[PDB]
Ligand SMILES: *[C@@H]1O[C@H](CO)[C@@H](O[C@@H]2O[C@H](CO)[C@@H](O[C@@H]3O[C@H](CO[C@H]4O[C@H](CO[C@H]5O[C@H](CO)[C@@H](O)[C@H](O)[C@@H]5O[C@H]5O[C@H](CO)[C@@H](O)[C@H](O)[C@@H]5O)[C@@H](O)[C@H](O[C@H]5O[C@H](CO)[C@@H](O)[C@H](O)[C@@H]5O)[C@@H]4O)[C@@H](O)[C@H](O[C@H]4O[C@H](CO)[C@@H](O)[C@H](O)[C@@H]4O[C@H]4O[C@H](CO)[C@@H](O)[C@H](O)[C@@H]4O[C@H]4O[C@H](CO)[C@@H](O)[C@H](O)[C@@H]4O)[C@@H]3O)[C@H](O)[C@H]2NC(C)=O)[C@H](O)[C@H]1NC(C)=O
């Protein structure tokens with residue numbers, strides 16, 4: 079079943095994962111790409 | 125609820141929404157032996173409804189309520205209305221003062237976003253504005269101020285301060301009425317039916333004051349001009365106002 | 380906030396189509412004329428940090444103010460002119476007209 | 484109203500380390516496991532510690 | 544105050560014009576300011592009917608002055624009779640309306 083594969087994979091990926099350290103903690107910087115989808119601009123108050 | 129998988133349904137046009145937590149989270153879960161899961165919760169939603177306020181206050185709108193999954197595209201989550209899907213109650217205890225609930229419909233579409241294609245469910249509530257508050261607030265006052273302006277035509281033309289006072293007071297209160305009437309609407313740029321009615325009333329009262337000014341100007345050169353002018357105004361102002369009322373209401377009602 | 384430019388680097392995915400939905404925005408009092416995306420770095424006492432900037436240019440619609448302030452003002456000024464046709468003997472009328480227009 | 488970067492610095496000899504780095508630049512999440520000062524504003528009325536999209540805090 | 548105007552000299556045309564129009568505008572101001580104590584309901588309330596009847600009385604006083612001015616200098620006896628009859632009818636009818644209104648809504 080694909081459920082067992084996905085569960086094993088997700089358990090392995092989160093096996094011993096340190097949230098305190100970023101990707102490439104001591105190495106080069108990580109590049110973050112940003113998208114924005116503006117749904118509304120509500121109230122422009124003077 | 126927090127221990128099983130729950131779909132990440134959210135409402136797409138909600139400015140803000142909250143669940144209920146008094147006295148406990150207003151939530152219910154039921155699980156049948158075949159694995160079927162029913163999850164219910166009480167919600168209060170402020171949902172945006174872009175109103176086209178042309179024809180205000182005789183304006184009718186379809187306000188939407190759109191929801192979809194936040195992170196699962198159509199390949200992963202599909203929503204479907206049941207036959208008995210959207211049920212309203214008595215509708216009399218609702219908080220619709222300026223509007224009356226006409227009816228509702230449901231729709232389902234597929235929206236393309238930056239992260240995929242998503243099944244989007246919509247409910248449309250039809251709301252028609254009630255013309256009972258703005259009548260009392262604006263239409264009767266403006267009409268009465270126009271009639272008060274007409275009263276100036278039966279005052280003796282020699283009494284300049286009397287008729288000029290009536291004229292200026294009528295114009296100033298029409299200005300105040302215009303401001304008060306506009307205070308209800310958002311600051312839109314286009315013209316609405318209420319603005320039309322108020323502007324026409326203002327034209328009427330200013331035309332009365334201008335008629336008296338002309339009558340006073342012509343009493344020094346040709347009196348019969350003014351003598352006939354007074355009766356002409358007495359007969360032309362109410363007739364023109366009644367005809368404007370007929371045109372205005374027949375237009376804005378059967379439209 | 381805490382990562383400097385030797386730890387993290389921002390950019391716009393698509394570099395101009397990173398932002399969507401600006402063309403559909405409905406404001407009853409304004410109009411979105413233009414918008415832009417910027418990429419730069421700022422410096423505080425604690426170091427240098429990456430920065431993205433999204434900016435909009437809002438042009439205010441004039442129609443509301445035409446029907447709300449300018450038309451009443453011009454009409455009051457015309458009402459003030461009306462007194463020039465009243466004869467000087469009718470002092471009370473002209474004074475009432477001018478004073479009402481001024482005070483309003 | 485005032486919007487500030489508020490910076491504090493102290494010595495905690497319990498946190499000395501030796502490694503390939505001279506400074507550890509840790510997120511807000513680490514500052515919860517160590518002792519931090521309980522600084523408050525005396526004439527403050529109702530303040531905000533911004534946490535969008537994460538707690539706007541930095542520990543080094 | 545609108546009814547006080549019936550006890551002025553018929554030659555005081557500016558004075559009675561001021562009386563009439565200022566009382567009518569005061570009634571409009573009071574109606575506009577009283578419509579704010581309520582929510583924006585779509586029906587009329589007892590207070591609305593009372594204000595409407597008061598506005599009718601003030602406007603009727605103004606119309607009565609306009610009539611008696613129309614009949615001065617051409618039928619002075621008619622104007623004098625209309626003023627005399629108004630001085631009695633307007634306050635009496637206002638009292639009658641008040642009794643009826645306050646007995647209707649204070650006994651439900
Ligand atoms: C920036 O900082 C902000 C400030 O910190 C931050 O906002 C905070 O975010 C957190 C996390 O998102 C919020 O915490 C969650 O709150 C959920 C409920 O939220 C509503 O209610 C709170 C008040 O919560 C009280 O009431 C509920 C219901 O009555 C209780 O369930 C709570 O425990 C809590 O009760 C205590 O307080 C009461 C007084 O209020 C006491 O009377 C009571 O006795 C308790 O002492 C409101 O503050 C919220 O308002 C805010 O959020 C809304 C969001 O729309 C805003 O609109 C609004 O403006 C406010 O900002 C809101 O109204 C909790 O449900 C949730 O806890 C569950 O999930 C977590 C995560 O998994 C679990 O750890 C937790 O244990 C809970 O799971 C259990 O319970 C659920 C039932 O709800 C079960 O289904 C589930 O299976 C699980 O059960 C298991 O564990 C149980 C133990 O709890 C056990 O009993 C069971 O047997 C079973 O084993 C979570 O606590 C917090 O409220 C926000 N606060 C504010 C002020 O915003 C913001 O996110 C930050 N931003 C960023 C970008 O980071």
Ligand SMILES: *[C@@H]1O[C@H](CO)[C@@H](O[C@@H]2O[C@H](CO)[C@@H](O[C@@H]3O[C@H](CO)[C@@H](O)[C@H](O)[C@@H]3O)[C@H](O)[C@H]2NC(C)=O)[C@H](O)[C@H]1NC(C)=O
Pocket residue numbers: 413414415417432434435436
């Ligand atoms: C709204 O205001 C912002 C901020 O003032 C405007 O952003 C400005 O945009 C111009 C043109 O893109 C930037 O000029 C550029 O400067 C760099 C600096 O090296 C130069 O290399 C480029 O050739 C260009 O001249 C300017 O820096 C930028 N301002 C800031 C503070 O970053 C924006 O244009 C205004 N209008 C709109 C519609 O956003």
Ligand SMILES: *[C@@H]1O[C@H](CO)[C@@H](O[C@@H]2O[C@H](CO)[C@@H](O)[C@H](O)[C@H]2NC(C)=O)[C@H](O)[C@H]1NC(C)=O
Pocket residue numbers: 205206207209228229230231
């Ligand atoms: C709500 O949505 C459902 C599903 O889209 C609609 O169900 C249809 O109802 C009509 C009866 O008028 C049936 O002829 C169709 O066969 C139904 N479709 C399905 C897929 O079962 C329902 O009409 C909608 N309710 C509204 C619009 O008020």
